[PDB]
Amino acid sequence: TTTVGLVCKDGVVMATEKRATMGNFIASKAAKKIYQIADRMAMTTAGSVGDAQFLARIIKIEANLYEIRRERKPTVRAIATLTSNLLNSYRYFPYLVQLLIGGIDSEGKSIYSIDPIGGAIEEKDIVATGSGSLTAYGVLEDRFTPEIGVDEAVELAVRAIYSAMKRDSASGDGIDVVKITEDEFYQYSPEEVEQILAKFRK
């Protein structure tokens, strides 16, 4: 599994692989990995499939509850830290997922990288998370400009998961890319993206 993150100045783009592989065993075919926390906020998970969906629904519900309480939308930081707190409370259950929680809030664009022991940290650069992560970081940091479209941003995130995939048997296809352009919450979804990576072949 691998999840990638990057900060563009027109938006926040993160990506997933939705067909995660054990090594040769699969039980997915449209298995969810991208969770819509708001129009400006996303949770992209790498890990176990199941633990992430259970954790995502808790978080979605409280994100809305929090909007309604302060009459003021959550920051990206606030939802990241909420998940850190939940993860430690439920460490007496076996819920293991490493998360990337990113989006847009009024302070700007930012990403927070969370591990299942807690922690949220600001990165306004490259971030990636999982065990396709090492390969993924190699492509991404070099080809990062922080002055990049949200159009030229999707091509790079694609490229990153793709390189990981051809040197992992743990990451498969299903490649989804989410873009948060500050007008809408667009999910390109597997179908189109599998054809962008078709042309990174011949």
């Binding site: 629904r57 979605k60 519900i61 409280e62 809305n64 509850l65 309604i68």
Partner: protein, 242 residues
Amino acid sequence: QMGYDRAITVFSPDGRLFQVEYAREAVKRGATAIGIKCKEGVILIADKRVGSKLLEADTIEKIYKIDEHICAATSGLVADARVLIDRARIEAQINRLTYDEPITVKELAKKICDFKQQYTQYGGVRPFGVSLLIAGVDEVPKLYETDPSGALLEYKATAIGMGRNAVTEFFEKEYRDDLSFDDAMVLGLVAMGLSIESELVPENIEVGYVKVDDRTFKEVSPEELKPYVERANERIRELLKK
């Protein structure tokens, strides 16, 4: 003197419990709110006039988000409303956790009715002296009132607070089930006008709505409310002539 209202646990010989009929009186002394149903959504309209100008003009609030698609208004103590609305918001959101479907107007109402009734039975805690209005469109537009007793009553149009008795009689004449969205908001803006015996200025009313087509709660901006209020003023003034 009675002592059939010493506790909530003493019935009157007539077979009634007096203490919830006085929590019913708690709602009346508070200010008015009207919930007005058409066939194209629901409207919710509530006092914000409160006190002189020492109090903030846009003082928060009678018109609460429950969800981003179910809203509520209150009358009675806005202490008993405030913690109750905290309880309401959680209750809708627990439904969202365990069903991944939004709470229907009817089902949220049923849960508030049980909650109220919990306090009503024990002598060790008093029930709220607050009533609540629950307005939505699940996919049928719906309007309810949940009582301080924790009783559930379905309404075509409803009001509570000071202006309760005026709005009732007023809608006995004019209201129809085939009023447009535009007509039903405006109609209740006359009625709201009559409730305080004054012209409606847009800074002393907060009005939200749930539309059927969107199914999304939206709040009417001060000056976007202004032309709807303006058309109401003609009829409210007219009627205050008498």
